[PDB]
Amino acid sequence: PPLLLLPENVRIRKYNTSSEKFSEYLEEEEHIQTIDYDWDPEHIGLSVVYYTVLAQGSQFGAIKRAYIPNFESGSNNPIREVDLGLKYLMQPDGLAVDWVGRHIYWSDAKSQRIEVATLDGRYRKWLITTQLDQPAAIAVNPKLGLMFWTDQGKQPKIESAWMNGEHRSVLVSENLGWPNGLSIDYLNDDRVYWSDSKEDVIEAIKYDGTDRRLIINEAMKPFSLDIFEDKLYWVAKEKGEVWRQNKFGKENKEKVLVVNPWLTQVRIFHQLRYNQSVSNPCKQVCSHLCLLRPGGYSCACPQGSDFVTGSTVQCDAASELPVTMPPPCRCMHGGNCYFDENELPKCKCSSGYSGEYCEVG
Amino acid sequence: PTRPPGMCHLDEFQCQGDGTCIPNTWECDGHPDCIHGSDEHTGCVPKTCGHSVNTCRASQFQCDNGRCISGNWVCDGDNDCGDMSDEDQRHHCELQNCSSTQFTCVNSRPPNRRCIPQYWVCDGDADCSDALDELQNCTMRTCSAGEFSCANGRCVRQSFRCDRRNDCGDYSDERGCSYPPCHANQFTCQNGRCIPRFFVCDEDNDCGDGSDEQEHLCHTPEPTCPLHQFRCDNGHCIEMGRVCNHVDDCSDNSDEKGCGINECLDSSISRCDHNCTDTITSFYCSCLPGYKLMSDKRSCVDIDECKESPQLCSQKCENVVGSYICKCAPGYIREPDGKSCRQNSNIEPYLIFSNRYYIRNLTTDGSSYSLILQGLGNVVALDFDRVEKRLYWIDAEKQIIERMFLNKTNRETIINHRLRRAESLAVDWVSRKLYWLDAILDCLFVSDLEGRHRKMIAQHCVDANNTFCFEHPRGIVLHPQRGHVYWADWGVHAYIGRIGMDGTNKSVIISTKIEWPNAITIDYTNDLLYWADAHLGYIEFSDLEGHHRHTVYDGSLPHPFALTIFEDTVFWTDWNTRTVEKGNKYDGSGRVVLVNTTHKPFDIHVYHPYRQPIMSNPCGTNNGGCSHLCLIKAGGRGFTCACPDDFQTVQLRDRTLCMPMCSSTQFLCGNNEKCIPIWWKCDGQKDCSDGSDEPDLCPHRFCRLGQFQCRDGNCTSPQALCNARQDCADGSDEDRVLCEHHRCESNEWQCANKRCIPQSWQCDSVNDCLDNSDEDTSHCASRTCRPGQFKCNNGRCIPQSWKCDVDNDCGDYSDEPIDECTTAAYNCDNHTEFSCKTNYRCIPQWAVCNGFDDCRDNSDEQGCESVPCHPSGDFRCANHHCIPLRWKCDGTDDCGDNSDEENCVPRECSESEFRCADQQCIPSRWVCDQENDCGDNSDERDCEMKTCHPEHFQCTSGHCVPKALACDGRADCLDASDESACPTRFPNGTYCPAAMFECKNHVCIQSFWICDGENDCVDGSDEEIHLCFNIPCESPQRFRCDNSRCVYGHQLCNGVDDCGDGSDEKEEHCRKPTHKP
Amino acid sequence: XXNXX
Ligand SMILES: *[C@@H]1O[C@H](CO)[C@@H](O[C@@H]2O[C@H](CO)[C@@H](O[C@@H]3O[C@H](CO[C@H]4O[C@H](CO)[C@@H](O)[C@H](O)[C@@H]4O)[C@@H](O)[C@H](O[C@H]4O[C@H](CO)[C@@H](O)[C@H](O)[C@@H]4O)[C@@H]3O)[C@H](O)[C@H]2NC(C)=O)[C@H](O)[C@H]1NC(C)=O
Ligand SMILES: *[C@@H]1O[C@H](CO)[C@@H](O[C@@H]2O[C@H](CO)[C@@H](O[C@@H]3O[C@H](CO[C@H]4O[C@H](CO)[C@@H](O)[C@H](O)[C@@H]4O)[C@@H](O)[C@H](O[C@H]4O[C@H](CO)[C@@H](O)[C@H](O)[C@@H]4O)[C@@H]3O)[C@H](O)[C@H]2NC(C)=O)[C@H](O)[C@H]1NC(C)=O
Ligand SMILES: *[C@@H]1O[C@H](CO)[C@@H](O[C@@H]2O[C@H](CO)[C@@H](O[C@@H]3O[C@H](CO[C@H]4O[C@H](CO)[C@@H](O)[C@H](O)[C@@H]4O)[C@@H](O)[C@H](O[C@H]4O[C@H](CO)[C@@H](O)[C@H](O)[C@@H]4O)[C@@H]3O)[C@H](O)[C@H]2NC(C)=O)[C@H](O)[C@H]1NC(C)=O
Ligand SMILES: *[C@@H]1O[C@H](CO)[C@@H](O[C@@H]2O[C@H](CO)[C@@H](O[C@@H]3O[C@H](CO)[C@@H](O)[C@H](O)[C@@H]3O)[C@H](O)[C@H]2NC(C)=O)[C@H](O)[C@H]1NC(C)=O
Ligand SMILES: *[C@@H]1O[C@H](CO)[C@@H](O[C@@H]2O[C@H](CO)[C@@H](O[C@@H]3O[C@H](CO)[C@@H](O)[C@H](O)[C@@H]3O)[C@H](O)[C@H]2NC(C)=O)[C@H](O)[C@H]1NC(C)=O
Ligand SMILES: *[C@@H]1O[C@H](CO)[C@@H](O[C@@H]2O[C@H](CO)[C@@H](O)[C@H](O)[C@H]2NC(C)=O)[C@H](O)[C@H]1NC(C)=O
Ligand SMILES: *[C@@H]1O[C@H](CO)[C@@H](O[C@@H]2O[C@H](CO)[C@@H](O)[C@H](O)[C@H]2NC(C)=O)[C@H](O)[C@H]1NC(C)=O
Ligand SMILES: *[C@@H]1O[C@H](CO)[C@@H](O)[C@H](O)[C@H]1NC(C)=O
Ligand SMILES: *[C@@H]1O[C@H](CO)[C@@H](O)[C@H](O)[C@H]1NC(C)=O
Ligand SMILES: *[C@H]1O[C@H](CO)[C@H](O)[C@H](O)[C@H]1NC(C)=O
Ligand SMILES: *[C@H]1O[C@H](CO)[C@H](O)[C@H](O)[C@H]1NC(C)=O
Ligand SMILES: *[C@H]1O[C@H](CO)[C@H](O)[C@H](O)[C@H]1NC(C)=O
Ligand SMILES: *[C@H]1O[C@H](CO)[C@H](O)[C@H](O)[C@H]1NC(C)=O
Ligand SMILES: *[C@H]1O[C@H](CO)[C@H](O)[C@H](O)[C@H]1NC(C)=O
Ligand SMILES: [Ca+2]
Ligand SMILES: [Ca+2]
Ligand SMILES: [Ca+2]
Ligand SMILES: [Ca+2]
Ligand SMILES: [Ca+2]
Ligand SMILES: [Ca+2]
Ligand SMILES: [Ca+2]
Ligand SMILES: [Ca+2]
Ligand SMILES: [Ca+2]
Ligand SMILES: [Ca+2]
Ligand SMILES: [Ca+2]
Ligand SMILES: [Ca+2]
Ligand SMILES: [Ca+2]
Ligand SMILES: [Ca+2]
Ligand SMILES: [Ca+2]
Ligand SMILES: [Ca+2]
Ligand SMILES: [Ca+2]
Ligand SMILES: [Ca+2]
Ligand SMILES: [Ca+2]
Ligand SMILES: [Ca+2]
């Protein structure tokens, strides 16, 4: 069964769609916007989620990453966060993660740009920074090598391009209000979905931009979308409720959760959503960045930097070493986590459970 | 040698008709060489080849009207004659000792000084002017608890409180009082007197100021009988059929008494000069065009069409008897219509106008609009130089005057010292000088075009009554042909002054109907003065002596600040509409708005070689031999030497001798060029030309540029020198030798202990100089207030405008003499000031409806819903106030009810501004300057990826810092990068002077900063604990902790530990150990 | 006032 992720202004709550009960997660945070996850990149059993934050006044926004258990449940684990070191963010309304490679995509709304870098945010470089007013959420389709982004200002538009910033195009520009969330149906011929905070409708269209359809209407101000199995997810911003409906728009609107208005997004935590089986087309020939494109790949340099003269691979910018990740608490099946003098996450097994990290028993 | 563009050689006649140059000797030769005969003009030299009247009895006084009265009743206190003949001073009612009970009753004014035979002296009652009879030889008394209690005066009834009457003898019953508004029966005089309507225009001054009998109500025009009816004698609008019709109805037959034959067929009656109009019942003389009806109503006088009305012809007018001729000035071509003049030089004009942050290049027609310079601080006034193609300006945010060629190269500051608030400037292109005005020192200066040889040439007041003084000087123009300097002033007594260019012959030009004269200029062809007023809203021109004013625009101008004239069009800068406009220079027709501006445009100038006419330099090639300033004498006919601001002018028989006299705290240059302040000495900046400013025996400098250095190495601001406060550790700023000959500027007054204070605080009842010299009675008595300021008996000085202010200024009410203030001598300035309804205060008119009680009785703020706002340059608030349109959407609540800020659409940023995240504009130089300027550091965002300004150094963290701050020995970058990469300063490999501690990241701090508990230098070398293992700290207050750190003071007993083990919050020191039980 | 540069 898929796991639901719901980030609030102060805390992040995960809800099981089958167990129908909540569980403890990261706490003691302020002004976060959106989350995204990567399915256990190290194949250990802890997936990595990327939650971005914004700040008020003097302090700037930032992006942080944290671990999440992949097993049935986990509690009392002291989840520790780490700041990516990405400075100069006002409000990251859009954020997405690419599992094919180690790149992260996020658009700073006030900076009217779309920023990419490594998973630890070292080789920052702007994709496109022109003809934007209010860059909304970002979606990525690595299989077809196409990203998606929208603007919700005086010129509401939905646009797609390659992951290296070229071949920019606009999908539709008519009968659009205030787009807020984007979603791609990875199984239905890469069909894309989006919402509207003004028209209060959810519409679908193909990746190339043909056969625009009105799926559902009167959704009570949807904010973000998520498609899993054969159903569509959305959250009413002004009320905080979560609803489900058939992705073909031929079913009643079911009710699941009622949450406070601080709720910002609904995201499904499942491996089948992203299909990690896709291989990496990169040949590891690029010096700093290896972005994706349909039918191949390309090399990129950090922002404001140029390649060495005569060459199109090596960048003049310096190369910095990656950043390690602190170990998580892998205590399983109702275990507890403890830190010794070495500060290693040494678990404390409960009654009837033995072994390292308390598996089985 | 070539003729200057469009003109002719210094010896060559130029034909007005077509501009070609004709030989000089061909002028007035009897042959019309020029194409229109302009070389044989009118001014060319010719060729020769009781018992009697009023006397009833010698013992009876004779009244002036013929009446007879007894002579023993003269000067008894009552007007027995009825025409004041018996009480007339000229009838010897003065200069005599009034005898016995008939006291003199000492007073100035005659009517209340009458020597009444008072037998009730000392009874306890006020009996004449000042009631001194109760003080001649009298006794004290104690007040009854019911009546009013005059302190100086007698204890009199409560009806005397606030009744327009002096009862205590010193108006103490009227001090602090108010007045209920006069009723319908009582007309309110301008000074606050309630007078019954029986006395209005009764030919008697009842109010005391003559307001009741002013001509506004005492005209009463007589009937006119317009056409279709006929007037005979006094207003009889009888039918024209009643003209000479033998019926005496026209008063005493006014038309039958004449109506004879034509009286102008002969000189026996009419004697009219030019023409005759004999008509019904009478005749009248009249004159041909070109002649004015003279005041004698008999003859004709030739009109001076040039001086009386310069509007008739464009550039220069020559009067002729009964007509006029207008010639164009050298360099202009006269159009075939005979009036219009066209510029002949092929150089085309273009406006240079001084926007905030920019110097702009605007073409006259409005087609082009470019930038000359950008990124300036705040340019309030500029002026050009034609000879070297330079461009001088003021920068009020930096207090400097710069210069630069017109091709944008060789920018250079020429003045940076002692310039408080420079308001305007002009360039003396003839004798190479620079004139400027400052509002704080309130003076007119002069300097060499290069900055050297500054001098003061006008201060204090301008006139022989100190009625007009430098208060807020602004705007200045030059007339080097006549050697004059003109400058405006918008103080309380707003005026336009004039002076020669060496300080002599200062005078007032315009002093009436002038409130806010922001601008001034001269049309060099007409020799016509020009100015504009921001309050009354006009643009007036006049002759150079101030006579014959005329109005271009009448009250339709929102707010001009700087005007300029070329050919026949005048360009001005308007603050309220934030526009540069243009129109005809006489009537204002053809008004065109050249350009909009996001910031108020301050100055403007037509750049053209004709705007600075070429004329011979008097000091040419020699400076007249003067080693110092060679100024132009008034009248533009000779020169005159001078000396700088701190030299003594001594005259020999044939050569002026200026020698230095500068103070102890001033340094005199080796070749005696000038004197510079002592703190300027020994700083590496070669302030002096000859190099004596920086000797090789100079001690090492620790302080930054501009800071005085104490002998032991400490630093302080320059104002701390000789201020009677020990501001250095050893007090080298208080050394006796530094103060022995201390001096300070004209606007501050020196005390006994050599600390000098502002002149307004002198004798202010508060001890400022610490020695009570400013409040010493001996000096506070003998001293004279500076010109233009009224002096109190208390010793205080006040601006003269504060006499009759109603509010107390001197504390002793010496500034409110009611008797003087209640007459006509202190009326309000008509049609420029607003008069209150109860009090006698006169307030400036623009203070009406401004959100403040100006008239002290809310009269100025009453009925505010009826005053109309300006039709073009005003914004109307919800509370019916009017504000300048420039203050709408500016971001500040100005109306008082946020009317301006409601529905505010954010403005656009200019060429040199950056739009903040929340839609706000800030200077580009504020981007990444190590400070939060956009409210939320959104300017500091993402600048690892941009270069800085050309003159700024960039830290590794992306912030921009001034280059001069690099490698100075002090941490200025956030990461101290500005010192981390640059070499040593000394040959022995040491970084900074040994008198300071050295941190490992090459920034040096003072010795005491070591282990101070704060990361003073970013590397933290000072906070290393091993340093203060060998360094003690101040044991009584500096808590030497267990591990030998010396956490102290405010961070003791705090919420967190600074020593590391919590001893600085331990309940052993904060808790009272003994606390002296 | 309304006349300060
Ligand atoms: C931006 O615009 C400015 C102003 O036009 C230019 O500055 C001028 O540049 C010229 C060319 O370099 C300068 O001309 C040279 O001036 C020298 C100094 O002369 C002084 O005395 C004379 C006479 O009173 C003054 O007119 C002058 O202002 C100086 O005070 C001369 O010694 C030079 O003589 C040499 O050339 C002449 C021919 O021109 C020969 O006859 C001589 O034998 C000798 O070889 C020369 O005349 C001029 O002085 C500059 N202006 C000023 C006021 O200094 C900038 O060049 C221009 N910049 C750019 C980049 O466009
Ligand atoms: C800026 O102003 C500050 C004060 O705010 C000055 O601080 C003084 O600095 C001097 C040194 O420059 C200190 O003098 C030292 O005094 C020690 C004994 O203290 C007595 O005498 C001093 C006056 O000299 C009195 O102030 C004090 O109250 C005591 O009465 C001496 O032991 C020190 O000797 C040093 O040099 C000798 C000879 O090489 C060595 O043998 C010693 O080991 C030692 O290194 C020294 O003379 C003075 O105490 C400080 N006063 C205060 C109140 O702080 C700064 O000096 C000044 N700026 C700079 C950079 O000079
Ligand atoms: C590398 O080189 C620098 C110099 O470039 C060294 O710094 C010098 O250190 C010496 C020794 O401390 C200093 O000499 C002493 O200066 C005292 C203060 O006078 C200075 O400051 C006053 C301020 O008014 C100036 O007027 C004056 O000109 C000086 O600049 C003097 O009072 C000392 O005199 C006393 O000792 C001498 C003997 O040394 C006796 O003959 C005297 O009678 C008296 O008792 C003395 O002159 C010198 O000032 C420092 N110079 C600077 C600029 O720092 C570094 O120490 C050195 N570093 C290393 C580690 O190599
Ligand atoms: C008002 O008075 C003026 C001045 O006296 C009168 O001007 C006169 O006008 C007449 C007609 O143009 C002039 O006569 C002419 O003189 C010339 C030259 O001699 C001659 O060639 C013509 O044939 C004609 O006779 C007369 O000279 C002139 N007077 C002067 C002194 O210039 C005017 O007529 C009077 N107008 C009224 C309404 O009274
Ligand atoms: C203010 O703006 C005006 C108009 O834009 C500027 O006038 C321009 O001045 C330059 C320099 O003199 C002219 O270039 C020169 O033209 C002459 C004659 O053709 C030629 O001999 C030179 O070799 C050079 O090309 C330019 O033509 C002229 N443009 C116009 C329309 O007048 C003026 O310079 C500006 N002033 C400042 C301080 O920026
Ligand atoms: C300068 O001040 C003198 C007074 O010292 C003025 O003279 C007085 O003028 C007023 C009218 O303005 C008269 O009422 C006084 O009678 C005059 N007194 C004397 C003694 O002269 C003088 O008018 C002032 N200057 C100017 C040009 O107004
Ligand atoms: C000093 O100033 C006075 C005016 O205050 C000048 O006097 C005027 O001068 C002009 C031109 O000579 C005359 O036409 C006026 O009639 C004068 N008016 C008065 C009231 O004096 C005087 O010329 C100036 N002196 C100098 C040195 O220029
Ligand atoms: C100044 O702005 C107004 C309003 O936008 C506009 O009508 C006017 O044309 C502008 N000025 C000029 C000379 O273009
Ligand atoms: C005074 O002001 C009035 C307008 O209120 C004006 O008509 C008159 O000309 C002015 N002059 C004087 C002093 O009467
Ligand atoms: C001729 O003289 C005039 C006046 O001094 C100008 O300097 C002009 O530039 C000169 N012409 C040439 C060609 O030098
Ligand atoms: C002109 O010439 C005559 C003689 O024909 C006289 O000398 C007369 O004085 C001269 N006029 C002047 C102004 O010199
Ligand atoms: C007051 O007047 C005297 C002359 O009587 C001096 O000019 C003195 O300088 C004046 N007062 C001041 C403060 O300058
Ligand atoms: C770097 O940035 C500054 C500020 O924006 C200026 O634009 C400057 O011209 C830039 N420098 C370069 C070499 O492009
Ligand atoms: C630092 O500069 C001084 C200047 O006199 C000397 O050149 C010294 O040798 C320099 N130090 C080094 C390490 O080069
Ligand atoms: Ca001739
Ligand atoms: Ca009498
Ligand atoms: Ca008495
Ligand atoms: Ca009274
Ligand atoms: Ca009267
Ligand atoms: Ca009649
Ligand atoms: Ca005439
Ligand atoms: Ca002043
Ligand atoms: Ca006034
Ligand atoms: Ca106005
Ligand atoms: Ca110096
Ligand atoms: Ca001091
Ligand atoms: Ca005082
Ligand atoms: Ca007063
Ligand atoms: Ca008011
Ligand atoms: Ca406002
Ligand atoms: Ca800043
Ligand atoms: Ca520095
Ligand atoms: Ca320290
Ligand atoms: Ca502490």
TrEMBL record, chain B:
It is found in: Apical cell membrane; Cell projection, Axon; Cell projection, Dendrite; Endosome lumen. The lineage of its organism: Eukaryota, Metazoa, Chordata, Craniata, Vertebrata. LDL-receptor class B repeats lie at residues 389-431, 483-526, 527-569. Coiled coil: none annotated. The chain holds residues 1224 to 3929 of 4660 of the full protein. Disulfide bonds join 56-68, 63-81, 143-155, 150-168, 162-177, 182-194, 189-207, 225-237, 232-250, 244-259, 703-715, 710-728, 744-756, 751-769, 785-797, 792-810, 849-864, 877-895, 889-904, 909-921, 916-934, 928-943, 948-960, 955-973, 967-982, 992-1004, 999-1017, 1041-1059. This is Low-density lipoprotein receptor-related protein 2. Belongs to the LDLR family.
